[PDB]
Structures are given as structure tokens and as C-alpha cells.
């Protein structure tokens, strides 16, 4: 029937292999286009990451929903900042490069 939970499981693997493929790609081809894709994959895999953690340890009819939203806000605020960083600042790729030769 309606493949809901199985598709989300696949979705986590799809972004995980993508993120695995993007760490050497950002190193070999550092550009302001690879900057955003890294921010996209880093936050999505991170959101579905902590998602599993919350649905595991947190038990509650009322406490579960608040954490789902509390995480969603924190993820949106994370992804927004990285896109702001890739626009109005140095940008992840060049930013790490600067940090490493310190």
C-alpha cells in the first residue's frame, strides 16, 4: 500500500550517499555552487539524523510533538544561516580552507 515510512528510509540513504559523494567533490571542485549543495545535504541529513534520535529516546503524547517542531525550527535556522554565509560571507568551501591554513 502507501509506501510512506519506507520512502523516508530510502530518502535518508539517498542524501547520505550524496553527502558522502560531496565531501571529496567540494575539496576537488570548490565553487560557490558546491557551497549551497553542501549546506542542503548537511542540514537535511542532519535533520533526519536527529529525527531518528528524537523518535527513539523521547517518549510522550505531548513531548514528542514539541521536539519535532523545536528541531524543525533549529534546522530551518541552521539552513538559513549557511545560505546567508554562502552569500554575504566567505562561504563554507573557502571558509574551511582559510581555517585550515591558520
Amino acid at each position: 500500500s502507501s509506501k510512506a515510512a519506507s520512502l523516508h528510509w530510502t530518502g535518508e540513504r539517498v542524501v547520505s550517499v550524496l553527502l558522502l559523494g560531496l565531501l571529496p567533490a567540494a575539496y576537488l571542485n570548490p565553487c560557490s555552487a558546491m557551497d549551497y549543495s553542501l549546506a542542503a545535504a548537511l542540514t537535511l541529513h542532519g535533520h533526519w539524523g536527529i529525527g531518528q534520535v528524537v523518535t527513539d529516546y523521547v517518549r510522550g503524547d505531548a513531548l514528542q510533538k514539541a521536539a519535532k517542531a523545536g528541531l524543525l525550527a533549529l534546522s530551518a535556522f541552521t539552513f538559513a544561516g549557511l545560505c546567508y554565509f554562502n552569500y554575504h560571507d566567505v562561504g563554507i568551501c573557502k571558509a574551511v580552507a582559510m581555517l585550515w591554513k591558520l
Partner: protein, 138 residues
């Protein structure tokens, strides 16, 4: 009786009882895969905490990235002490990267036996020490 009713009757009996829970984390034997699964969750949580705090302070703190980098040089930490901070970042990142590959191989259905769990597990652990040193001095 239905399966649901049996499960419902269990909890009503046991939550309102004097029965004690048997120990689990106190008594259970430690193993490499079991301890390596904990560190993967640890490195996951710790890695997202850094990623979140990096983008979060991009909107909440004044100045560009260069001004913050010049602020680091103000403390002028030693080459060995700055290497420790450099090693401290990559170590959880690489452990979670390599063990992630091991996890993704399991999703294909390969390497799911007891001898293989210890083998590929040690391979990840060794690849973590070498890649992290190979990147801390990069």
C-alpha cells in the same frame, strides 16, 4: 482475544504493579559493535551541534568570517595546541564518515555476520586514526 488486547492487558497489569524492571545497561556485556554504535550516535549528535552552531552564529553574531578568524589569532595558541583543536574537529567527523560507509554497506545486506562486524569495525577504527591524523596535519 486479539493481539492488540493482549498488548493492552500487559501494560495495564505491569504499570500498575509492584514488579521490578530487570537490569539492562548495568549487566549487559560490552562489545565492539555495540560500543561503536553508541559512538556513531555520539559523533552524529556532536557533529550536528557544530554544523548548527556554525550557521546559527552566521545570523546572530556581528562581523564577517575574516574578523572572527583574526580573533582566533589574538589568542595565538601554540602549533601543537592548535593541532589539538584541528585534530579535535576531524576525529568525530571521520569516524562518522567511515562508519557511515559501513552502515550503508549493511543497507545493501553485505557483511552482517559476527566475524565481519569485528573485522570491518576494526577497519573503520583504523581508517579513522589515519585519516584524522592525515587531515590534522593536512
Amino acid at each position: 482475544t486479539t493481539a492488540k488486547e493482549e498488548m493492552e492487558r500487559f501494560w495495564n497489569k505491569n504499570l500498575g504493579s509492584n514488579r521490578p524492571l530487570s537490569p539492562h545497561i548495568t549487566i549487559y556485556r560490552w562489545s565492539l559493535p555495540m560500543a561503536m554504535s553508541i559512538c556513531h550516535r555520539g559523533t552524529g549528535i556532536a557533529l550536528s551541534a557544530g554544523v548548527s552552531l556554525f550557521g546559527l552564529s552566521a545570523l546572530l553574531l556581528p562581523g564577517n568570517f575574516e574578523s572572527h578568524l583574526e580573533l582566533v589569532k589574538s589568542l595565538c595558541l601554540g602549533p601543537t595546541l592548535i593541532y589539538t583543536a584541528k585534530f579535535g574537529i576531524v576525529f568525530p567527523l571521520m569516524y562518522h564518515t567511515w562508519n557511515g560507509i559501513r552502515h550503508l554497506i549493511w543497507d545493501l545486506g553485505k557483511g552482517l555476520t559476527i566475524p565481519q562486524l569485528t573485522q570491518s569495525g576494526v577497519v573503520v577504527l583504523i581508517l579513522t586514526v589515519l585519516s584524522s591524523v592525515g587531515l590534522a596535519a593536512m
